[PDB]
Design a protein around this ligand. Structure first.
Ligand SMILES: Nc1nc2c(ncn2[C@@H]2O[C@H](CO)[C@@H](OP(=O)(O)O)[C@H]2O)c(=O)[nH]1
Ligand SMILES: [Ca+2]
Length: 104
């Protein structure tokens, strides 16, 4: 079973932890990757009810299992905070325009 389902993509907690660790590492070191410069500060305009405090950052999580290293980021993102706490997993899939909806 999927711990997180983003549209048609299935993610286990381990996939999320791996992606989060990569994203947080870059944030701590002060570096970015990709033309869109990830990780991105995430403002949470959607108003998701995260149980952890902001600031938030979004980092791509890939359905292929690989860690994002540039190129097409897909539609899914892991959101973590300044303290390296998981806020949630979100996706553009099933959302209008460039908005996000939470993965189930
Ligand atoms: N929808 C949305 N996008 C945000 C927010 N904060 C920052 N962004 C960033 O703005 C960009 C365009 O919507 C997104 O890039 P991304 O789609 O590559 O993740 C996203 O990371 C927010 O709260 N909501
Ligand atoms: Ca997997």
């Amino acid at each position: 079973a999927c711990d997180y389902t983003c549209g048609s993509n299935c993610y286990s907690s381990s996939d999320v932890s791996t992606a989060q660790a990569a994203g947080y590492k870059l944030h701590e070191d002060g570096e970015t990757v990709g033309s869109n410069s990830y990780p991105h500060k995430y403002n949470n305009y959607e108003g998701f009810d995260f149980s952890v405090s902001s600031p938030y950052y979004a980092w791509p999580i890939l359905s292929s299992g690989d860690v994002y290293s540039g190129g097409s980021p897909g539609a899914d993102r892991v959101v973590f905070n300044e303290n390296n706490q998981l806020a949630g997993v979100i996706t553009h899939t099933g959302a209008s325009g460039n908005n996000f909806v939470e993965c189930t």
